[model samples]
Target: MALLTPDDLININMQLQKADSAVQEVTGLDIKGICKALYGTFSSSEKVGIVPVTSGNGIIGNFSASLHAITQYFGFDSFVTDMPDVSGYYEAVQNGAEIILMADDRTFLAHNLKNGKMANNQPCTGIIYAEIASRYLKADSKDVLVVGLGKVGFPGAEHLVQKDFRVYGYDADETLLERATSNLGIIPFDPANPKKFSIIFEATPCANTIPEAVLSENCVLSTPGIPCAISEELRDKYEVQLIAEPLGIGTASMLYSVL
Candidate 1:
């Protein structure tokens, strides 16, 4: 379904600029660079398709509609489907979809990556989370803990490190932890002995990934995963700040990349 008008595109651009301003204010990273990279990758004549693999029923439509509006504004043909299966992706591709967008679990991405069907490798969710979390953290507070070290978590940790944050990583998988430590030089933290971090970035799909661990009084929690890692009770009781589901910014960035 069509979700954007000419006026809506204008408003969407304004909102994207606001999000860029917020990111600049917090992390000092330029969203324009992301835009440039995207522009370099795809031309306006390209055909783009989006596959809705997420459980959020309406969220897929929102994502697809936003993508359609943005890409269409940039002079590209974009299409989105309600279908949420591999066959749907193949159908879009068969119909001339060059770049297919899938934003969900690592397994979905991993399967495509294994089969060499994935186009982009840059993880957007983690990058977006780090950018949003930067707004809630103190400039000098570099102590941050990242939970989960897979596709989403690893990229988040890497972005935090790039922003000069002292990042600590935790994951149930020992191999992921090892990779994070060796590849990113992130300090390994024991999940059982949670430390007091000024900011925590969680990307695990599990609902209860956050342990009953110590945290700074005003710690910030940035999570992109659906069943959020922290319990509401723990957050309210400790007065922890939360930045949840900041994927719209990521969506905008992704659109810019494939345009």
Candidate 2:
């Protein structure tokens, strides 16, 4: 898992409306609506609690606070515990929070205390990014490319395959590529015999997989890779409809998934 920095979360709280509009443009649904389509209906009455964990590499700057602000923006009563870790968990429970959100270096998660439902940020981010690409695709064929096969991209490949799209799986690692192909029945992406795809979902943490030749004529790219895989020059060059964000979309998806 990539550790989120202050830079990754810059202005996320202040850009709620812009984020909503961006999501609407890509998925034809706002944050709430997309969540509803992907998961269960969100109950505004659920009180949300955010716990900041200082374990493993210590607390991420603004992560908990941003979550609090976002939950409030979604019309849910939210609270951030003064404490961290177990003390914070207890504090949230004492304050009547039904849903709890927390993260360490390796894991980010939301759990519903009343229902025992849980959502992990990795798969959640992948699934949401896939949904965005699925909605934005305009090609007659359903050949979608997944540019990585680890935590994020593999789940996204699963979601795309579930939606009846012919998902092409690509990973530099032979093990990962083989796992995705054997598990999800995804076609292995061949750089030699490359196939043009209208929709590409990229999830590598680095930004070196995509190239100019990979894109189709009318391509739409969706990725959660920290440094966006597609370069600005390439974006302007191809006029690619890109959907990439560090946290807001995935966090919103997590909240709605566990709601």
Candidate 3:
């Protein structure tokens, strides 16, 4: 994808803003740009891949909702995958897929993970995205940055460190950070740093955890199924940037590609 010009940003941002307000959901719809942003710039050289698995109906519902948007927007072309294993990922790479997403089955848990739900709170999606980004992007695992230390955040940090960016974690929840340090080799850092990363993923469900101005140029910002909190403004501000929306409708305009 070409770097977005100032005029392009203005035009796309306006359309996306309208779509975001029109869509009614905790996470808004309009995810085409997110898909293109990640896949468009995906370099074929990188090796490891990441996948953040979601459990329960609500979470899966959110995941599927985003997937539906992408499929609807792109039309079941090569962009969509129904893989259930690692080989599927390899196939995507072979077929010129820079980014590959695999949605997990929600049958493992019936409801949310609160009262006696299955302990499958593992970070499948995070691990997969990071691994894939590193493998194809050809960057080291240590270069990967995982924000938010909750269920998804903690595991993402662990996987990134294990894969190897001098890992730094930022989260308001001190308890989660403490647990992250103890279990994983993640060093804590102030969240205000403006340093750009080769790969950045936001697992937090919070609306606007990272400010619009903070988004690094050329860095891929992968969000779960939720719509980005400051997506419209960020698009307006940044030219020719990429936002990976694995979940769906992450962008404001339901249409991702433009003429």
Best by TM-score: 2
Per-candidate local distance difference test: 0.63, 0.85, 0.44
lDDT string, candidate 3, 64-142, tens digits: 3344343333443324334434555555556654333443443211111112212232354454344334432423333
Candidate 1 positional error at 163, Å: 2.3
Superior by TM-score: candidate 2 or candidate 3: 2
Ranking by lDDT: 2, 1, 3
TM-score of each: 0.61, 0.95, 0.47
Clashing pairs in 2: none
Candidate 1 residue spans exceeding 4 A from truth:
1-122, 135-140, 257-259
Report the Cα RMSD per candidate: 7.7, 1.5, 13.8
Model 3 segments more than 4 A misplaced: 1-122, 133-142, 212-214, 239-259
For model 2, state the Cα shift of residue 50 in Å: 0.4
- TM-score attained by model 2: 0.95
Q: In candidate 2, what are the lDDT values of residues 90-172, reduced to their tens digit?
A: 99999999999999888889899988989999999999989888887265668899998898899999999999998988899
Estimate candidate 1's RMSD in Å: 7.7
